[PDB]
């Protein structure tokens, strides 16, 4: 199917306590596969999914040096940014970076991404054309002019069209079923009396991958959208996800309610009931 690779960097300054903390994580779809933390004992890129472990020592060594250099660059960017915004040199600030590629079933690039946020606000982003920047304000225009003069967009385009696509293809081949084949949810309905007149029906979806899912309660086939409590999809901690949806119903009317589950891993949408 269609797949993505993304890297997420976070740098947080701490003036008076040393250099900023830099953390990076890499994802293929909804699966984290690598991490780096500048505050680790002997910082290096580390595996976080079984299928990446097979990469040789040259892979880990090259990526580790990249993150160490990027941390130093982010430190200089944080210094420049507080200057652009005329901010105190005493305070802590955050620079986040996100980049990567979306590819189709054939493995061809559909869309590239390279964008940045300062103190939680969009700052600068590479446009869809992979050739031009969009700046959020006059500070970001300073960065834009620097990056235009340095031909930074060409450096990003080269990665996003080349290495990003090629390495994503390789991770998918190595990952196999864990990445290419969706794991459908294990599902069940629970019932919890609230009083003699009302009970909660809760529809559970557990152990599914990827995270995208829809859970809806219907009463005689009419969606109960305005009366359903839905929790945000949440990680189980073993690389799968969980969600539930609940409705409060009159005692003795439970048979009127069905839960409808849509997930990529299911052959067809499921209809569940209290049983």
């Amino acid at each position: 199917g269609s797949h993505s690779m993304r890297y997420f960097y976070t740098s947080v300054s701490r003036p008076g306590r040393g250099e900023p903390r830099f953390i990076s994580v890499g994802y293929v779809d909804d699966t984290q596969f690598v991490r780096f933390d500048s505050d680790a004992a002997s910082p290096r890129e580390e595996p976080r999914a079984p299928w990446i472990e097979q990469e040789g020592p040259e892979y880990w060594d090259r990526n580790t040096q990249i993150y160490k250099a990027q941390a130093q660059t982010d430190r200089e960017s944080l210094r420049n940014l507080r200057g652009y915004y005329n901010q105190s040199e005493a305070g802590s600030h955050t620079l986040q970076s996100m980049y990567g590629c979306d590819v189709g079933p054939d493995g061809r690039l559909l869309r590239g991404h390279d964008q940045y946020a300062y103190d939680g606000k969009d700052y600068i982003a590479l446009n869809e054309d992979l050739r031009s920047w969009t700046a959020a304000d006059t500070a970001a225009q300073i960065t834009q002019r620097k990056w235009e003069a340095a031909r930074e967009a060409e450096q990003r385009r080269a990665y996003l069209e080349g290495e990003c696509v090629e390495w994503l293809r390789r991770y998918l081949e190595n990952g196999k079923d864990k990445l290419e084949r969706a794991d459908p949810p294990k599902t069940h309905v629970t019932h919890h009396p609230i009083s003699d007149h009302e009970a909660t029906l809760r529809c559970w979806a557990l152990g599914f991958y990827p995270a995208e899912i829809t859970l809806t309660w219907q009463r005689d086939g009419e969606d109960q959208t305005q009366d359903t409590e839905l929790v945000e999809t949440r990680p189980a901690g073993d690389r799968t996800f969980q969600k539930w949806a609940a409705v409060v119903v009159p005692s003795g009317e439970e048979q009127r309610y069905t839960c409808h589950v849509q997930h990529e891993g299911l052959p067809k949408p499921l209809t569940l009931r209290w049983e």
Partner: peptide, 9 residues
């Protein structure tokens, strides 16, 4: 694999 470092902002 990650992208090689950017220029600073």
């Amino acid at each position: 694999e990650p992208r090689s470092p950017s220029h600073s902002m």
